Amino acid sequence: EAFLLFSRRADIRRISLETNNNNVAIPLTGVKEASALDFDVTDNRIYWTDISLKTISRAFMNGSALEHVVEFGLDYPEGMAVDWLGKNLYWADTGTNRIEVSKLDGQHRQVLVWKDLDSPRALALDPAEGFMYWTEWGGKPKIDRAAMDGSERTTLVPNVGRANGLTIDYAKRRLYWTDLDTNLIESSNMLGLNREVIADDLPHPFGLTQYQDYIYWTDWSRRSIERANKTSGQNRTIIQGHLDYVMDILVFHSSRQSGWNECASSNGHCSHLCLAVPVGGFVCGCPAHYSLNADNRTCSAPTTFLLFSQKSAINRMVIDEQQSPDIILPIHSLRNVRAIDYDPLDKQLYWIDSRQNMIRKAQEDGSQGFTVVVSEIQPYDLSIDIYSRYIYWTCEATNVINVTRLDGRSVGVVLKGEQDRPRAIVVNPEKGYMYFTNLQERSPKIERAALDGTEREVLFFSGLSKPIALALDSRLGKLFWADSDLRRIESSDLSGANRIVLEDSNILQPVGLTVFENWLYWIDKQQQMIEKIDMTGREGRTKVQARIAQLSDIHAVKELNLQEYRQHPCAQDNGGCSHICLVKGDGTTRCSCPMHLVLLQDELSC
Amino acid sequence: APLLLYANRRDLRLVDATNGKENATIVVGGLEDAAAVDFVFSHGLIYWSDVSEEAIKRTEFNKTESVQNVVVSGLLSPDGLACDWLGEKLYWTDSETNRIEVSNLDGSLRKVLFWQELDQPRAIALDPSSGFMYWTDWGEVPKIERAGMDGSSRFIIINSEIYWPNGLTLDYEEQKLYWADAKLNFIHKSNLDGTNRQAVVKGSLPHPFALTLFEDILYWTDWSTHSILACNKYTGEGLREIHSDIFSPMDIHAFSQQRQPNATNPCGIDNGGCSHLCLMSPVKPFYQCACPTGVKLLENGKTCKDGATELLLLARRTDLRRISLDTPDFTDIVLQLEDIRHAIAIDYDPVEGYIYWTDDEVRAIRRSFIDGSGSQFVVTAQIAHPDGIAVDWVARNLYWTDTGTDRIEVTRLNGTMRKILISEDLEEPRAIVLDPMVGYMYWTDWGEIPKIERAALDGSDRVVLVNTSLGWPNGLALDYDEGKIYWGDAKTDKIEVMNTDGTGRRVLVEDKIPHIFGFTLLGDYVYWTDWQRRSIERVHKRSAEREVIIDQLPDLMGLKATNVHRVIGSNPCAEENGGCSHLCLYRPQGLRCACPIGFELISDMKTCIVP
Amino acid sequence: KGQEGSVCLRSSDCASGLCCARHFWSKICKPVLKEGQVCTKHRRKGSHGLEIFQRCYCGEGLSCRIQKRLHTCQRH
Numbered sequence A: 001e002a003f004l005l006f007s008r009r010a011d012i013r014r015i016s017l018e019t020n021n022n023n024v025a026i027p028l029t030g031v032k033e034a035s036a037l038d039f040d041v042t043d044n045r046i047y048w049t050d051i052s053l054k055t056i057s058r059a060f061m062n063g064s065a066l067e068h069v070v071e072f073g074l075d076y077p078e079g080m081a082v083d084w085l086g087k088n089l090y091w092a093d094t095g096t097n098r099i100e101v102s103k104l105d106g107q108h109r110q111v112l113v114w115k116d117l118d119s120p121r122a123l124a125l126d127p128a129e130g131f132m133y134w135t136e137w138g139g140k141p142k143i144d145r146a147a148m149d150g151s152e153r154t155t156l157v158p159n160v161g162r163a164n165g166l167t168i169d170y171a172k173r174r175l176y177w178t179d180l181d182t183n184l185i186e187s188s189n190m191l192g193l194n195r196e197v198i199a200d201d202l203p204h205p206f207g208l209t210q211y212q213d214y215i216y217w218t219d220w221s222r223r224s225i226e227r228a229n230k231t232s233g234q235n236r237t238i239i240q241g242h243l244d245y246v247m248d249i250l251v252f253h254s255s256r257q258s259g260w261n262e263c264a265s266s267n268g269h270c271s272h273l274c275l276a277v278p279v280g281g282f283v284c285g286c287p288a289h290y291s292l293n294a295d296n297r298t299c300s301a302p303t304t305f306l307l308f309s310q311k312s313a314i315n316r317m318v319i320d321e322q323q324s325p326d327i328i329l330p331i332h333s334l335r336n337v338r339a340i341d342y343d344p345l346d347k348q349l350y351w352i353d354s355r356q357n358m359i360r361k362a363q364e365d366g367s368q369g370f371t372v373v374v375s376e377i378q379p380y381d382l383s384i385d386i387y388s389r390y391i392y393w394t395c396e397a398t399n400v401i402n403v404t405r406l407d408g409r410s411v412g413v414v415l416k417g418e419q420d421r422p423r424a425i426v427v428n429p430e431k432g433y434m435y436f437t438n439l440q441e442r443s444p445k446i447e448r449a450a451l452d453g454t455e456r457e458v459l460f461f462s463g464l465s466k467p468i469a470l471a472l473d474s475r476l477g478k479l480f481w482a483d484s485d486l487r488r489i490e491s492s493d494l495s496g497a498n499r500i501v502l503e504d505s506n507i508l509q510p511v512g513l514t515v516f517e518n519w520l521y522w523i524d525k526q527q528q529m530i531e532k533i534d535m536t537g538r539e540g541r542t543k544v545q546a547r548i549a550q551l552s553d554i555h556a557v558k559e560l561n562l563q564e565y566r567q568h569p570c571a572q573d574n575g576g577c578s579h580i581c582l583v584k585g586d587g588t589t590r591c592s593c594p595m596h597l598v599l600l601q602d603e604l605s606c
Numbered sequence B: 001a002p003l004l005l006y007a008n009r010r011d012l013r014l015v016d017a018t019n020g021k022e023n024a025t026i027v028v029g030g031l032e033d034a035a036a037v038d039f040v041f042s043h044g045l046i047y048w049s050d051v052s053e054e055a056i057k058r059t060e061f062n063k064t065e066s067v068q069n070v071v072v073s074g075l076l077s078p079d080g081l082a083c084d085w086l087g088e089k090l091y092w093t094d095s096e097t098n099r100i101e102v103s104n105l106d107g108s109l110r111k112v113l114f115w116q117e118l119d120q121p122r123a124i125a126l127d128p129s130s131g132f133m134y135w136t137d138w139g140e141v142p143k144i145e146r147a148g149m150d151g152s153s154r155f156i157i158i159n160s161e162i163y164w165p166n167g168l169t170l171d172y173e174e175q176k177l178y179w180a181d182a183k184l185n186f187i188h189k190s191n192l193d194g195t196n197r198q199a200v201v202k203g204s205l206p207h208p209f210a211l212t213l214f215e216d217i218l219y220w221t222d223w224s225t226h227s228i229l230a231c232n233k234y235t236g237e238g239l240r241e242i243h244s245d246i247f248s249p250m251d252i253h254a255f256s257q258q259r260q261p262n263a264t265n266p267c268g269i270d271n272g273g274c275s276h277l278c279l280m281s282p283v284k285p286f287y288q289c290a291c292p293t294g295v296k297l298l299e300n301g302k303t304c305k306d307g308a309t310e311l312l313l314l315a316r317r318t319d320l321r322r323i324s325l326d327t328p329d330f331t332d333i334v335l336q337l338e339d340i341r342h343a344i345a346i347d348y349d350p351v352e353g354y355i356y357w358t359d360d361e362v363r364a365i366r367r368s369f370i371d372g373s374g375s376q377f378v379v380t381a382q383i384a385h386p387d388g389i390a391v392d393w394v395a396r397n398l399y400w401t402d403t404g405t406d407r408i409e410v411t412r413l414n415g416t417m418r419k420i421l422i423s424e425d426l427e428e429p430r431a432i433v434l435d436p437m438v439g440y441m442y443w444t445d446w447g448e449i450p451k452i453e454r455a456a457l458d459g460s461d462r463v464v465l466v467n468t469s470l471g472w473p474n475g476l477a478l479d480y481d482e483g484k485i486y487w488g489d490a491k492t493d494k495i496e497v498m499n500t501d502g503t504g505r506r507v508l509v510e511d512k513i514p515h516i517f518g519f520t521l522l523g524d525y526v527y528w529t530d531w532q533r534r535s536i537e538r539v540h541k542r543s544a545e546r547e548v549i550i551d552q553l554p555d556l557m558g559l560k561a562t563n564v565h566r567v568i569g570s571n572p573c574a575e576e577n578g579g580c581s582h583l584c585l586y587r588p589q590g591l592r593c594a595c596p597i598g599f600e601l602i603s604d605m606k607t608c609i610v611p
Numbered sequence C: 001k002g003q004e005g006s007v008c009l010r011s012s013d014c015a016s017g018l019c020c021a022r023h024f025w026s027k028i029c030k031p032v033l034k035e036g037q038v039c040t041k042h043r044r045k046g047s048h049g050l051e052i053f054q055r056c057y058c059g060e061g062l063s064c065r066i067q068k069r070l071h072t073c074q075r076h
């Protein structure tokens, strides 16, 4: 039999179509604030969003198999729907202004709508036709429609208030919804036309659903679940009374999830996502930032992209003509990032946790996490030598430049001084040097040295107040730094000649630098922006993203040239050295050691 | 042979004989943290203060244990103490309550002299010969002060070359006063005016804690050196240290009948001076008339009124207190009682002088005679959170609300004849006020829809006075012969006013209001507690302007401003209880008789019996 | 100060063009309404207490009036 399911803050419950009949809660655990609700009858599963946990979860009707399907990059998942045919999960978020999709188990997440979105609320799917519908609650609320791949977006009904409980009467081709601003239940055909008012004398309608010849709705004022003639609006009865805060309601029956499409069969032979469309049956989709290969079936991950970290998150964003949305990387280990780097060789992400005081590692996937430095130790900044497989980092506690292998074992200190205080650091193993800021008391400076700590020299000691970030371009032999106090970005040759101010206007607090192709990207903590200038000066200063809170670091990742990589004398066997492998001006390699070791007669061992 | 007497934290001690054989005698002992001492020699009395016990005590010089508590309340750091051997009074400074007070030599008739512009008053010296007391307060701006021992002519004499101005002591032979200094390390000397400021031991050698003298010899303590010292009265010369290896010597005096020269008493044994207090004075009669704290003196003088007229009753978490409203001093709280756990609401009945109050851990209502063994219980059964109580002073019944059970209930003042008047499912009753004339009882209650209701004095004619723009309505006072009704609301943070029928409404002032809120009206003034419940404001209801009568008093819960004795209004219930055998409850139409639970009203409409 | 979406307690915790409005069971900073934008109009007094999706008021020199049925921010 068809029964009624509804979400209600701390719990999700089921009732029958009968008046005053039994009301039982689904045995779930750890539910804080359930809102959006859907189901999968064929799999006997329920899906719900929790706007307090900021997650989307699922489980069987027997409460078993409680799992979180989406737990990142959510603000207010007010809308959510199940595509029982292509086995996909759609949802909308009023806080992030995004309509997203993924497999029912959560993998291969992708953004479908991100531009011109103003609080998408309710979401209804029609996989049989290849259309999706949603309500929007902006300054100018409306009900839009689009292909289930996010294509062909258009407004179906413009003259409406905050609409909710958007539900489709599949058998009789109509749309029903409540209106929280005019307190009525309306209906229209699948084109937004033939718009009739089903019920108007309702005090506070909220939830809605339909089955057979009745519509069921909730009312916050009358604390109730009532039903009525779906065409007439009469023959009204109350199904349940004294129900406080009934968020979403739905009809759990097989007849609600019928129909068929090309996606239901072998997933359309799609490598990742199978997305139904009105014209053409279906289209293959890919995870965020992935490209659909020439075969129209398989996907390839992004090769080059840009990484920017905040306090609690590390994001990835691509540089497309399409302006593809940035996404939050699902690293569970993240808590308080202070700096980020990236190993292109093994394709893994490194960061510094300022609270747990460690340098952690993980792939963008979030898996294969591993701590490479733990403790006193207080890591400030890191720079990966991808050739010798080493991390050069600075300690805010012992004021030294420490270098550690990627696996966890130490190489040793390469720079320590009584009055020295190394902070920002960037290694240039292609030329054999490293660059860092030295925040000595009352006289800040930018220095260079060999990767072993020798050949120290001061590049700049004047025109500095808070050298806060470094970045270099090995190909063009350029150095870049940002000064928080002087509010400006400067550049120079690796030698230190040709010092030039790039930007010194409309900057407040630069804290990160990175070179991406011919552009210099930087982040402004206070302005909450990512901006870029053309290093060639041909094009002009450009805004990339605004309203990003708590920016900490930004980092460009280019595709590794494996062949060009192996040309480096330290690429394999580390140049036959035990510890540090330096590169002479003539492309030859010596061997050096940390502060506590000495080079032996082998001229290879320490 | 000058005997020296000195406090010592652990005991009081007498030493010197003729400065030989090291007979330091432990006069009193087993004290805890003694600071000041003094004596009245004639009567053989020794007083001291104890900073850990916050009491001042006295004993008999003779072989005896006899010790009597003298002040045991209202004290924090009594570090200066001076007995008046002539007018027979006791003076003492308190460096933390920043007050200066006096009493009889038994702690009685305790009057606060000064309390304004005092920063850490410590050392104190009396001149009963004249009517002059001297003391030193020091702080942001240090100074030595003179005034009459009566509270008059407060003069600042020495106010320069001082830092931590130290022990005071006067040469009656020379009409000069000496003082030391715990920082600038000198001894000085002047005439009894601010005049002729001469150095006796200038130069950084003396680090005196307490000065005394006896025949040309200045003695004093240096706690640091744990010693007693002495030198010429006229120059620094002679500076030997009397035998002294003493464990923290504090206050010290020359224990000699000569250091208190006797003479004619400005009041005789006749008159006894006045009715309560005869204090010495420079003023012509040479004596002056005083009442205890918070008590005003008649236009004739010499005769004190009876107690205070108005009175502001406090409820803190674990004590009750009363501030008088008859005098300017205010911050003279005074308290009482035992086993008070968590007091909430307070009220008072001027006719019998019982304070009534609620306690919501104990879950009971109780009454007392103020500073009286009044204390009996009243209700102890079926109570939750008595967040408000009202005395009906005419029908002689007690109303109280309850938050946990959402009820209003009435009993006779003695807690007999309990009867539930109102019991609402949603809203829950909080604060309550009465109008035994006109026969109305108004109350705030919280709930999903916080409102202010009203009814007759038996719950009968429920009218919802206020409904909208109220979050958590708190206090609720009543201006009677002006027909307005003042209240507060914690959520909205504004004190509003109203017509007695719910119409003249308006914000009076904005205010950050505590959830547990003390709030009462009496005579043009309103009193409430601040957000931090450590201070009380007095506000003009007709004039809007605020003022703070007392701070640094934490855990303030509920207030009641009230006349003592004075009563107003009436109705036929005052006539042998309306003719009702149990409960008589007044209404606008007319009184109705009621019954305790289980009883039955007979067709008399006057009588109850058990069926 | 608080940006759009940021958790707030009082409108003072929010930026210039924002107010502290409740969303579900906490409050976040929401933008003030501009001319033409749909604004809230409560029928019953109680419906105000029940609202969990609260809009901000209309901006400076704007009044929440009916269209000539929704209400939009219009100039006096």
Ligand SMILES: *[C@@H]1O[C@H](CO[C@@H]2O[C@@H](C)[C@@H](O)[C@@H](O)[C@@H]2O)[C@@H](O[C@@H]2O[C@H](CO)[C@@H](O)[C@H](O)[C@H]2NC(C)=O)[C@H](O)[C@H]1NC(C)=O
Residues within 6 Å of the ligand: A042, A043, A044, A060, A061, A062, A064
């Ligand atoms: C809770 O239910 C799940 C899955 O639901 C089952 O299969 C549905 C299609 C429907 O027929 C429901 O009535 C069934 O309960 C159970 O998982 C299955 O368990 C069985 C037996 O162990 C196993 O053979 C299946 O492969 C499992 N999965 C599915 C999809 O069938 C699960 O056992 C139930 N939990 C409890 C505690 O009863």
Ligand SMILES: *[C@@H]1O[C@H](CO)[C@@H](O[C@@H]2O[C@H](CO)[C@@H](O)[C@H](O)[C@H]2NC(C)=O)[C@H](O)[C@H]1NC(C)=O
Residues within 6 Å of the ligand: A373, A398, A400, A402, A403, A404, A408, A409, A410, A411, A412, A413
């Ligand atoms: C530099 O980094 C290494 C780790 O990469 C740190 O070496 C640790 O030193 C402590 C002693 O202080 C040992 O107990 C640990 O076992 C070492 N860790 C490892 C993994 O070798 C070192 O402390 C860092 N700083 C300095 C100044 O050497």
Ligand SMILES: *[C@@H]1O[C@H](CO)[C@@H](O[C@@H]2O[C@H](CO)[C@@H](O)[C@H](O)[C@H]2NC(C)=O)[C@H](O)[C@H]1NC(C)=O
Residues within 6 Å of the ligand: B262, B263, B264, B265
């Ligand atoms: C103690 O002081 C009192 C008060 O001065 C003295 O009592 C009488 O004081 C009057 C006042 O001048 C004298 O005329 C009397 O002669 C005093 N009594 C008598 C008759 O001796 C008292 O004398 C003083 N005690 C002593 C002796 O020191």
Ligand SMILES: *[C@@H]1O[C@H](CO)[C@@H](O[C@@H]2O[C@H](CO)[C@@H](O)[C@H](O)[C@H]2NC(C)=O)[C@H](O)[C@H]1NC(C)=O
Residues within 6 Å of the ligand: B396, B412, B413, B414, B416, B577, B581
């Ligand atoms: C308080 O209790 C006393 C006795 O403890 C009551 O005194 C009388 O009690 C009888 C018995 O009901 C009544 O008929 C009398 O009317 C009471 N006397 C008075 C003064 O009315 C008393 O009723 C209670 N409270 C009062 C009114 O004192």
Ligand SMILES: *[C@@H]1O[C@H](CO)[C@@H](O[C@@H]2O[C@H](CO)[C@@H](O)[C@H](O)[C@H]2NC(C)=O)[C@H](O)[C@H]1NC(C)=O
Residues within 6 Å of the ligand: B464, B465, B466, B467, B468
């Ligand atoms: C508090 O709200 C209640 C219910 O809304 C008020 O009671 C009635 O309200 C309706 C309108 O909603 C009026 O038409 C009636 O006149 C009101 N009752 C009557 C007959 O007085 C109630 O008045 C409100 N409380 C107040 C008095 O502020």
Ligand SMILES: *[C@@H]1O[C@H](CO)[C@@H](O)[C@H](O)[C@H]1NC(C)=O
Residues within 6 Å of the ligand: A213, A229, A230, A231, A232, A235
């Ligand atoms: C609903 O209304 C239609 C016409 O308004 C009517 O034909 C139908 O019988 C009504 N109810 C049901 C149960 O179909």
Ligand SMILES: *[C@@H]1O[C@H](CO)[C@@H](O)[C@H](O)[C@H]1NC(C)=O
Residues within 6 Å of the ligand: A234, A235
């Ligand atoms: C619904 O109400 C109408 C009249 O309002 C009545 O004719 C009809 O029988 C009722 N129910 C159905 C199932 O049509």
Ligand SMILES: *[C@@H]1O[C@H](CO)[C@@H](O)[C@H](O)[C@H]1NC(C)=O
Residues within 6 Å of the ligand: A294, A295, A296
């Ligand atoms: C991929 O799509 C294009 C455009 O529809 C088509 O021309 C091409 O044949 C497809 N490639 C396949 C199916 O291998």
